[PDB]
Design a protein around this ligand. Structure first.
Ligand SMILES: Cc1cc2nc3c(=O)[nH]c(=O)nc-3n(C[C@H](O)[C@H](O)[C@H](O)COP(=O)(O)OP(=O)(O)OC[C@H]3O[C@@H](n4cnc5c(N)ncnc54)[C@H](O)[C@@H]3O)c2cc1C
Ligand SMILES: Cn1c(-c2nc(C3CCC3)cn2CCOc2ccc(OC3CCNCC3)cc2)cc2sccc21
Ligand SMILES: Cn1c(-c2nc(C3CCC3)cn2CCOc2ccc(OC3CCNCC3)cc2)cc2sccc21
Lengths: 666, 133
């Protein structure tokens, strides 16, 4: 996409149609004639183009109207309404930009933001940009949340995110032009090494990969073409579907064998009848030849009856010899038809132990992606976010992804080491109660007009709760929190003094021994300048490896690496770090997944704000006070950094519209 | 609209494997025993036929007779007439068999014999006694 139409694609908007969000703010245009809509659509795309062409400076309304052309630049109130909408909802002038018009001298409204991850930081930047008093409360001693970067010496490795999943339509492409991010492409080549330590031949690596991708489409066929989504009143999971598909393939392998050997008994039994017929014919022939002989012994001359006897027996013997010959002809056909069937047997097995292990590695690869064992993923909705995938190669943040939230946190009122304990919201405002994580007896009270909660889903799931809500959150909210899945995957960082792996290979895999351990140190990543290998722990192994010390984990890593590269080629690591996201009390997991019995609609439920009951009974409807942002609140981009980034811009626009008014809706 | 080519996914088979917990293992065992049962029935007939194949050892070679290559003749010697009556009494209307017994009489010449010498040789009575068997 190029031109003004590319600016719309880069902003995740259709270039030739007004969205639902735009219809709410411009109902006069979408309900009007077609000619007006095309003008508005151009003003929006042209404005997005100007901001994306140079996202390091603030795009003002004066600059927008100057670079517009007739007849689009004639209607000024339209250009103003469009620019104010784009600025309010974080489509332009978001992130880190030099400000042309200095900030308003005095602030309006007070918003407390719980959590200083990317979602909270993005919202704080926007709310402060709009002229509001913003204060963030972070339980940790750092910003970024699940964007965590380990730094020691020359070693920089992310236990947090560190991958940008394509720049095509990604808001991070705008941030990468604002922050010095060192983005590097990932080479897709990935060799497999079995547990013995030797590589998988390209014959097996591709035959098992194709069967893996074939098994996945079979589950999608089971879901969308057979409605196989419930089993004994319980929802079907992606793991259950793969088990059913595989067993049906192992069943078909046996059905093919039984019908093949059945072709042999049927043919071999026709031979039995034929040989029984031939052995009886050879009997009659043996007896007839004896009678013809005895009739020939009668030496001439003889009467016509004795002569007829010889002629008769000679005919009957020749007639039986012609039958026996035609039966030996049939025997040749059936006897070679047996060597035909006995030479082309069907497949002996569907998959062998050596194959099923390599298939388990591809399954663990899927459990790494969704950060959960496949037994929990919703069969129908696990990949619901695939339709909005960005375009382009995936890139790594080579200088550490912490440079993004740290740069966002510049100039914000951030209260670190402050653990929120209680969120009180009434019709007349809110008060957040928090303690100092170092000495927990020191209590802090924060009054505010609105609270923006970006707590991780794992924190919202704790029982007993780590954060109490007064009044309690409504059932439709809590039920959504329980249905949604919050997964877990961990990273093991190994810092060596020299490179002993293949430098041109960004990742290589280790085939696990058992299905249970298939995600335990199954994948290694060479992504950094310095000699740093990164090993993954996913699936069911992710939770169990957190109960094991770092020395034993690193020990299993060096054992795997020794079998692959050489017993004497793997030195001792100089620095090691093992993440444990499930045990992290401020995360309680990695990121969200669409659990079975849930759907993407729960993501939207998580985003709906909470409105308290009226103070005075009989008073007008109160204002929404409690707002939710975060990775778990955006339906089309969950479990990502750009998804958290977008959710923060969303709530900051909604909170601003609530407490500053929407002047662009007229 | 259809599964991936190679996979087999029918609504009938999905229900038979998700009926209970071990319905999968149960279905996969009845096919294992059916395979073993068919496989040993092969070696049973493969052994029954292997014994019959040895009774037919030698074929019927010590029992064939040389080929009588004699030209077809037209006139009926009194010997060939008496051969025809006995062949009719034994073979009926099998003209090919009667032709082979006489030796030098084509199939059509045998058919003409049934009409020309019909009265004189009482071919009607002779045929009605072949039918009495
Ligand atoms: C191992 C791993 C790898 C990942 N890799 C990628 C990747 O390559 N690409 C990608 O796009 N995404 C990736 N992600 C996901 C990404 O990290 C998240 O989607 C995103 O960082 C979450 O943003 P958030 O602000 O919604 O949550 P968080 O970043 O977790 O922010 C929540 C904040 O609230 C704080 N908090 C918690 N409890 C309290 C409390 N009681 N009081 C006060 N503050 C509290 C936390 O300390 C934290 O700062 C990865 C995640 C993990 C776990
Ligand atoms: C695919 N890839 C790999 C990679 N190649 C291999 C092997 C298999 C043959 C070579 C393993 N890996 C590990 C990835 O594991 C993934 C990646 C994407 C997945 O699909 C998700 C999509 C959204 N919904 C959830 C599923 C699932 C697992 C390295 C990199 S770098 C950028 C892309 C990529
Ligand atoms: C884990 N991760 C990665 C990622 N880490 C690595 C390696 C380097 C060290 C670890 C490579 N890559 C890229 C390929 O791996 C993917 C790509 C897309 C995925 O899709 C998820 C997207 C969110 N919804 C659920 C599915 C999952 C894995 C990029 C993203 S983006 C959200 C998380 C995540």
């Amino acid at each position: 996409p190029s031109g003004v139409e590319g600016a719309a694609f880069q902003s995740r908007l259709p270039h030739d149609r007004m969205t639902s969000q735009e219809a709410a703010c411009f109902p006069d245009i979408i309900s009007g004639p077609q000619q007006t809509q095309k003008v508005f659509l151009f003003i929006r795309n042209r404005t997005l183009q100007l901001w994306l062409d140079n996202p390091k400076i603030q795009l003002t309304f004066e600059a927008t109207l100057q670079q517009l052309e007739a007849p689009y630049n004639s209607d000024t109130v339209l250009v103003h309404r469009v620019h104010s909408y784009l600025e309010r909802h974080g489509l332009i002038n978001f992130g880190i930009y030099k400000r042309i018009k200095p900030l308003p001298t005095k602030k309006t409204g007070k918003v407390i933001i719980i959590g200083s991850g990317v979602s909270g930081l993005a919202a704080a930047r926007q709310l402060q940009s709009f002229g509001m008093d913003v204060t963030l409360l972070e339980a940790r001693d750092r910003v970024g949340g699940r964007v965590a970067t380990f730094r020691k010496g020359n070693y920089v490795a992310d236990l947090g995110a560190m991958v940008v999943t394509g720049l095509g339509g990604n808001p991070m492409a705008v941030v990468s032009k604002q922050v010095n991010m060192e983005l590097a492409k990932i080479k897709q080549k990935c060799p497999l090494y079995e547990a013995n330590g030797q590589a998988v031949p390209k014959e097996k690596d591709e035959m098992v990969e194709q069967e893996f991708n074939r098994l996945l489409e079979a589950t999608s066929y089971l879901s969308h073409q057979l409605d196989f989504n419930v089993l004994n009143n319980k929802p079907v999971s992606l793991g259950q579907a793969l088990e059913v598909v595989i067993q049906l393939q192992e069943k078909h392998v046996k059905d093919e064998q039984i019908e093949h050997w059945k072709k042999i008994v049927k043919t071999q039994e026709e031979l039995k009848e034929l040989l029984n017929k031939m052995v009886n014919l050879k009997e009659k022939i043996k007896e007839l030849h004896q009678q013809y002989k005895e009739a020939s012994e009668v030496k001439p001359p003889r009467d016509i009856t004795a002569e007829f006897l010889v002629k008769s027996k000679h005919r009957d013997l020749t007639a039986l010899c012609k039958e026996y010959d035609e039966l030996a002809e049939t025997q040749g056909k059936l006897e070679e038809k047996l060597q035909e069937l006995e030479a082309n047997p069907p497949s002996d097995v569907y998959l062998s132990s050596r194959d099923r292990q390599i298939l388990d590695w591809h399954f663990a690869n899927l459990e790494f992606a969704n950060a959960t064992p496949l037994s929990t993923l919703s069969l129908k909705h696990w990949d619901q976010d695939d339709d909005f995938e960005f375009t382009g190669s995936h890139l790594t943040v080579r200088n550490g992804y912490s440079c993004v939230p740290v740069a966002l946190a510049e100039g914000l009122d951030i209260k670190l080491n402050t653990a929120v304990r209680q969120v009180r919201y009434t019709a007349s405002g809110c008060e957040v109660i928090a303690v100092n994580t170092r000495s927990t007896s020191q209590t802090f009270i924060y009054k505010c007009d609105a609270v923006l909660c970006t707590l991780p889903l794992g924190v919202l799931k704790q029982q007993p709760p780590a954060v109490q809500f007064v009044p309690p959150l409504p059932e439709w909210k809590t039920s959504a929190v329980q249905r949604m899945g919050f997964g877990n995957l961990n990273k093991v960082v190994l810092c060596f003094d020299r490179v002993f792996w293949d430098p041109s290979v960004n990742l290589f895999g280790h085939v696990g021994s058992t299905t249970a351990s298939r995600g335990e140190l199954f994948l290694f990543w060479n992504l950094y300048k310095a000699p740093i290998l990164l090993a993954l722990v996913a699936g069911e192994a992710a939770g169990i490896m957190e109960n094991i010390s770092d020395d034993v984990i690193v020990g299993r890593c060096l054992a795997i690496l020794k079998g692959i590269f050489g017993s004497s080629a793997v030195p001792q690591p100089k620095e090691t770090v093992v993440s444990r996201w499930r045990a992290d009390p401020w995360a309680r997991g990695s990121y969200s997944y669409v659990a079975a019995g849930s759907s993407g609609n729960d993501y939207d439920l998580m985003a709906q704000p909470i409105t308290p009951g009226p103070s005075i009974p009989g008073a007008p409807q109160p204002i929404p006070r409690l707002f939710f942002a975060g990775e778990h609140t955006i339906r089309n981009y969950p479990a990502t950094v750009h998804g958290a980034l977008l959710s923060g811009l969303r709530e900051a626009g909604r909170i601003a519209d609530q407490f500053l008014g929407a002047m662009y809706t007229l | 609209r259809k599964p991936p080519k190679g996979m087999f996914l029918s609504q009938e088979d999905v229900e038979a494997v998700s009926a209970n917990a071990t319905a999968a293992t149960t279905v996969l065992r009845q096919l294992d025993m059916e395979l073993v049962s068919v496989k040993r029935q092969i070696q049973n007939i493969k052994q029954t036929n292997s014994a019959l194949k040895e009774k037919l050892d030698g074929g019927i070679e010590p029992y064939r007779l040389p080929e009588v290559i004699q030209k077809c003749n037209a006139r009926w010697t009194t010997e060939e007439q008496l051969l025809a009556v006995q062949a009719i009494r034994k073979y009926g209307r099998d003209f090919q068999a009667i032709s082979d017994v006489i030796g030098n009489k084509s199939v059509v010449q045998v058919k003409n014999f049934f009409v020309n010498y019909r009265r004189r040789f009482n071919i009607d009575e002779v045929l009605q006694e072949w039918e009495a068997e």
